[PDB]
Design a protein around this ligand. Structure first.
Ligand code: HEC
Length: 108
């Protein structure tokens, strides 16, 4: 919603414990159950090469930035009804800020 840069060190810890099970961040990194996230910021949803998305994730057609990413991560199935994942969200604004601060660098 209203992103402010936090701590990437904490964000990296949050990524490992809440995201890495399903996602990688490096260029060329493997898809897991979820897509590799390199280049995610500034790109339209559904466009990781080699990954097959749900209709819901494609049709949202959101151009990812820090703010819509923070809303999405709060509750992905609320922001994209019908998206499929065994992930329930990062409810704390401070965690999202830290995570996104790391992710912006890690996927760059
Ligand atoms: C497994 C239980 C997952 C966890 C943990 C995380 N993600 Fe996820 N993610 C997962 C799937 C199966 C998908 C595609 C869903 C679909 O409907 O096709 C996603 C998608 C994303 C996206 C969108 C990618 C795009 O539009 O190209 C993003 C930005 C994303 N995931 C980020 C993300 C973060 C930051 C996580 C930890 C807080 C996280 N995911 C965990 C599966 C799973």
């Amino acid at each position: 919603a209203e992103f402010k840069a936090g701590s990437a060190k904490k964000g990296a810890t949050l990524f490992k414990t809440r995201c890495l099970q399903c996602h990688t961040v490096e260029k060329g990194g493997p898809h897991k159950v979820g897509p590799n996230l390199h280049g995610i910021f500034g790109r339209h949803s559904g466009q990781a090469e080699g990954y097959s998305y749900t209709d819901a994730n494609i049709k949202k057609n959101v151009l990812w930035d820090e703010n819509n990413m923070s809303e999405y991560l709060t509750n992905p199935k609320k922001y994209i009804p019908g998206t499929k994942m065994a992930f329930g969200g990062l409810k704390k604004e401070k965690d999202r800020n830290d995570l996104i601060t790391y992710l912006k660098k890690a996927t760059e």
